[PDB]
Scaffold this motif. Structure first.
Motif, PDB file in Angstrom:
ATOM      1  N   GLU A   1      21.524  37.412  55.016  1.00 30.09           N
ATOM      2  CA  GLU A   1      22.726  37.514  55.998  1.00 30.09           C
ATOM      3  C   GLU A   1      23.701  38.719  55.560  1.00 30.09           C
ATOM      4  N   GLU A   2      24.015  39.573  56.489  1.00 25.42           N
ATOM      5  CA  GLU A   2      24.936  40.630  56.232  1.00 25.42           C
ATOM      6  C   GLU A   2      24.526  41.527  54.831  1.00 25.42           C
TER       7      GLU A   2
ATOM      8  N   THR B   1      24.442  41.021  51.354  1.00 28.39           N
ATOM      9  CA  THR B   1      24.418  39.841  50.346  1.00 28.39           C
ATOM     10  C   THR B   1      23.597  40.205  49.242  1.00 28.39           C
ATOM     11  N   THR B   2      23.732  39.508  47.929  1.00 25.24           N
ATOM     12  CA  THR B   2      22.897  40.019  46.850  1.00 25.24           C
ATOM     13  C   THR B   2      21.631  39.306  46.835  1.00 25.24           C
ATOM     14  N   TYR B   3      20.426  39.953  46.364  1.00 32.38           N
ATOM     15  CA  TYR B   3      18.982  39.128  46.082  1.00 32.38           C
ATOM     16  C   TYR B   3      18.375  39.424  44.897  1.00 32.38           C
TER      17      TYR B   3
ATOM     18  N   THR C   1      20.962  44.693  47.434  1.00 32.04           N
ATOM     19  CA  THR C   1      21.977  44.128  48.178  1.00 32.04           C
ATOM     20  C   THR C   1      21.432  43.899  49.444  1.00 32.04           C
TER      21      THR C   1
ATOM     22  N   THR D   1      20.327  41.129  58.109  1.00 31.20           N
ATOM     23  CA  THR D   1      20.575  39.537  58.300  1.00 31.20           C
ATOM     24  C   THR D   1      18.936  39.030  58.795  1.00 31.20           C
TER      25      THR D   1
ATOM     26  N   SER E   1      19.605  34.729  46.833  1.00 33.97           N
ATOM     27  CA  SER E   1      20.976  35.425  46.871  1.00 33.97           C
ATOM     28  C   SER E   1      21.805  34.582  45.731  1.00 33.97           C
ATOM     29  N   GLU E   2      21.769  35.437  44.417  1.00 34.12           N
ATOM     30  CA  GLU E   2      22.559  35.095  43.391  1.00 34.12           C
ATOM     31  C   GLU E   2      21.731  33.609  42.836  1.00 34.12           C
TER      32      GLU E   2
END
Length: 152
Positions: free
Chosen positions: A55-56, A58-60, A107, A111, A148-149
């Protein structure tokens, strides 16, 4: 909503699909091994896995170990299919007789929703196994995760 599973190919390909090859995918070992047919140029072979949670911006963290019987260097990444589109992964999946593990946190600046609709193919993973290894070769990944995180 639900990712592919922290550590896939540990018994089944789950959903990872491979087109431009022989029959379906072959695992039975703990690593998604797709059979790339020689002369895999022209149209180009590849593997796609629909079902991601991005989504948008975000971190991954992408973690996969691809290995081709030959030293083939194709292309691998991710993106959205069904608006608003937007790719965030852009690297080169190197391969060879040895194991090629991969670990990098990017990052996701896009999305990838999860709506299997006609005009909404959501986002997935794109593996271009075409235009790389001349002779016949293959790709053997294993444990592909992307959240993410996460703990560390």
């Amino acid at each position: 909503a639900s990712p592919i599973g922290e550590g896939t190919f540990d018994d089944g390909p789950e959903g990872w699909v491979a087109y431009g090859t022989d029959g379906p995918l072959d695992t039975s070992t703990g690593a998604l091994c797709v059979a790339v047919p020689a002369g895999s140029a022209q149209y180009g072979v590849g593997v796609v896995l629909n079902g991601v949670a991005i989504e948008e911006g975000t971190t991954y963290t992408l973690r996969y170990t691809a290995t081709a019987s030959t030293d083939v260097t194709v292309r691998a990444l991710v993106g959205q299919n069904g608006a608003p589109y937007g790719t965030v992964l852009d690297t080169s999946p190197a391969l060879t007789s040895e194991p090629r593990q991969v670990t990098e946190t990017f990052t996701a600046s896009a999305t990838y929703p999860a709506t299997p609709a006609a005009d909404d193919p959501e986002g997935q993973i794109a593996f271009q196994l075409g235009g790389f290894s001349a002779d016949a070769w293959t790709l053997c990944l294993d444990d592909v995760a992307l959240d993410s995180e996460v703990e560390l």
